[PDB]
Design a protein around this ligand. Structure first.
Ligand code: HEM
Ligand SMILES: O=C1N[C@@H](Cc2ccc(O)cc2)C(=O)N[C@H]1Cc1ccc(O)cc1
Length: 394
């Protein structure tokens, strides 16, 4: 006798498990057990993943309902599971979106300058270099401080909340609340700080005192700062780190992008498509009985949308494991999700990775792993797959 298939399958972000293609072929929606002991439906084909993400009756907000089957324990207050809905209801969606585009004057130059400075420092120090802790994550952190309008020197402490905030735990995490409450206090102080006049927080600070927003809560304004910093920094730092591994393990592609940096955007789109950074399926709770393939999902059941299930589906992306720069459907992957919850930072995430990779290939055209790939240490019970250190030489 065996127990019900458990998720997630592997914390390794450098290879997709054979099980994903097996499930997709044989049972593209099937029952699994999560780390909390709950049962859930794991969806692993492009067609079914898109169906679930495009049907609002599969609800993110409702995953926070008391007594629901859970993927993992909340690390934020339950109301924050409705974060984007709260932002939209407050009439703040357009302003938040506008503040986090990569198109602000000087922002891309700041990204380039920061990436180049980080790389110069690594070169000065000598190989081996850690491309996660000393490149990708600081680049993500510096970017988000700039985007938010907050001091660069405040980034590191905010960043250090993230190894706990983005845990994927069976049980509540006391440290997550300590850090959350502290980080909220910090953002509340930022809103009251007359020096903060630029970026997302400068704009929220002005809107907070505009009569058209007088009944939006201070709680929401501070929450937007903490959540956009955290989701943006964890997602961009983790994606760039694992994309760097994908590229290092493809010297022919690495050389092509070095020789023809104008192909970097197409390269980054394929790196997004094959990315294994999301450690868990995207969770939704059914709010009605809904037919998904061969399964009638019942009201109150948990559904997990496996992004790599969709993104490696050969019926949508032929030769799915191969990076191909000339696909006819290159942005149709689900790396940024789909539907109501489509990533609001997608353009910024693309630009962070493009500029990071452009700078790395210019400064370190000979970049390679400095340890056998199996020696990377993959973070466990986390909402992202990332190596603890990424040692390289050049
Ligand atoms: C390569 C980088 C990124 C990747 C791969 C990524 C991926 C995703 C995905 C898959 C979702 C959908 C989650 C779901 O449907 O349950 C999402 C949502 C979200 N992301 Fe991103 N993200 C990235 C960068 C960013 C950035 C730069 C920001 C902000 C500065 C951001 C903020 C958010 C927020 C607030 C949501 C929730 C949206 C909603 O619920 O409507 N992300 N992201
Ligand atoms: O619960 C939320 N929390 C925040 C994201 C977030 C989670 C934890 C944290 O410490 C900070 C931000 C949100 O914007 N919306 C929801 C849904 C969500 C969760 C994770 C994620 O990567 C994206 C969306």
């Amino acid at each position: 006798a065996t127990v019900l298939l458990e998720v997630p399958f592997s914390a390794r972000g450098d290879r997709i498990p054979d099980a994903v293609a097996e499930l997709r072929t044989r049972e593209p929606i099937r029952k699994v057990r999560t780390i909390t002991g709950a049962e859930a439906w794991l969806v692993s084909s492009y067609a079914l993943c898109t169906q679930v993400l495009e049907d609002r009756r599969f609800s993110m907000k409702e995953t926070a309902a008391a007594g629901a089957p859970r993927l993992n324990a909340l690390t934020v207050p339950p109301e924050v599971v409705n974060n984007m809905g709260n932002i939209a209801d407050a009439g703040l969606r357009k302003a938040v979106m506008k503040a986090i585009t990569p198109k602000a004057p000087g922002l891309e130059q700041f990204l380039r300058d920061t990436a180049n400075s980080l790389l110069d420092n690594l070169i000065t120090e000598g190989a081996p270099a850690d491309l996660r802790n000393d490149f990708a994550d600081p680049l993500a952190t510096a970017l988000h401080c700039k985007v938010l309008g907050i001091p660069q020197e405040d980034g590191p402490k905010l960043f250090r909340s993230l190894s706990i905030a983005f845990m994927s735990s069976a049980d509540p995490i006391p440290a997550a609340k300590i850090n959350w409450d502290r980080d909220i206090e910090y953002m509340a102080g930022i809103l009251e700080n007359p020096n903060i006049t630029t970026g997302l927080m400068g704009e929220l600070s002005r809107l907070r005192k505009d009569p058209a927003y007088s009944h939006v809560s201070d709680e929401l304004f501070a929450t937007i700062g903490v959540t956009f910093f955290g989701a943006g920094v964890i997602s961009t730092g983790s994606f760039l780190t694992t994309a760097l591994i994908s590229l290092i393990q493809r010297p022919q592609l690495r050389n092509l992008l070095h020789e023809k940096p104008e192909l970097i955007p197409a390269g980054v789109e394929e790196l997004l498509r094959i990315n294994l950074s999301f450690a868990d399926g995207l969770p939704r709770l059914a709010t009605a009985d809904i037919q998904v393939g061969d399964v009638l999902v019942r009201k109150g059941e948990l559904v997990l949308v496996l992004l790599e299930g969709a993104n490696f589906d050969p019926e949508h992306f032929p030769n799915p494991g191969s990076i191909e720069l000339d696909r006819p459907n290159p942005t149709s992957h689900l790396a940024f999700g789909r539907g109501q919850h489509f990533c609001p930072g997608s353009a910024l995430g693309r630009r962070h990775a493009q500029i990071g990779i452009e700078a790395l290939l210019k400064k370190m055209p000979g970049v390679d792993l400095a340890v056998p790939i199996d020696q990377l240490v993959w973070r466990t019970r986390f909402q992202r797959r990332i190596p603890e250190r990424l040692p390289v030489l050049w």
